[PDB]
RNA sequence: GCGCCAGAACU
RNA sequence: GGCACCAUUGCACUCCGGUGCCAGUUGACGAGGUGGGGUUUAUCGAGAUUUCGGCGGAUGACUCCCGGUUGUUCAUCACAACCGCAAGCUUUUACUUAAAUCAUUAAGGUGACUUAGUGGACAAAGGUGAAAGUGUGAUG
């Protein structure tokens with residue numbers, strides 16, 4: 001269902017860890033205040049990002065507005081997080 | 091036990 | 102660590118896919134040490150994944166010299182150890198800021214690491230102060 005964290009995939013893998021993290025904050029800041037954006041370049045986690053919002057309302061607005069948006073020459077694919085994040089759950 | 095850095099090791 | 106190529110469209114919350122090329126970083130912690138030449142593997146502990154390995158230096162050692170000093174009064178010689186502004190040797194102590202490692206804290210770096218601090222200390226060789234026993238022979 002809905003979640004404080006949104007799962008993003010289909011991201012450009014050629015972009016380094018912190019540059020992506022800062023460019024993602026550049027867009028998702030308008031929907032609500034972001035707690036953290038978790039990015040990893042491992043085989044299992046590359047081209048993926050976890051933006052953690054404080055409110056669920058900010059996650060839904062981000063999911064609705066940024067879906068299919070071209071980001072680094074690639075259209076974004078946004079879902080909700082399957083489970084809560086460690087900053088939200090604990 | 092003083093200086094350097096084509097190996098080696100580490101990132 | 103970058104960069105390139107290949108593989109990868111996944112649901113994470115501590116650093117984790119291959120392959121090449123190209124960089125970067127470390128790389129001796131103090132204590133002590135220089136009459137001239139020759140030869141050489143250049144003293145002492147502390148620490149310990151590299152204080153490894155390679156290059157350069159080097160006050161060491163050995164040996165032949167030059168010049169001294171001691172060899173328990175003096176001098177000339179040979180002989181032994183010793184000094185090189187010091188000086189026979191065995192034998193005891195104390196003193197001569199140990200520093201780094203270790204433990205941490207800040208600053209810088211993507212990182213390996215770098216710089217600067219702080220804390221606790223811990224040597225040996227040499228040298229010196231003082232305490233014990235002995236130094237070669239022949240001689241004008």
Ligand SMILES: N[C@@H]1[C@@H](O)[C@H](O)[C@@H](COP(=O)(O)O)O[C@@H]1O
Nearest residue numbers: 091092129143144152158159161
């Ligand atoms: N004091 C040291 C010597 O003890 C050592 O013999 C020399 C050579 O260094 P290495 O150990 O690299 O041969 O360097 C220094 O001079």
Ligand SMILES: [Mg+2]
Nearest residue numbers: 091092129130
């Ligand atoms: Mg040094």
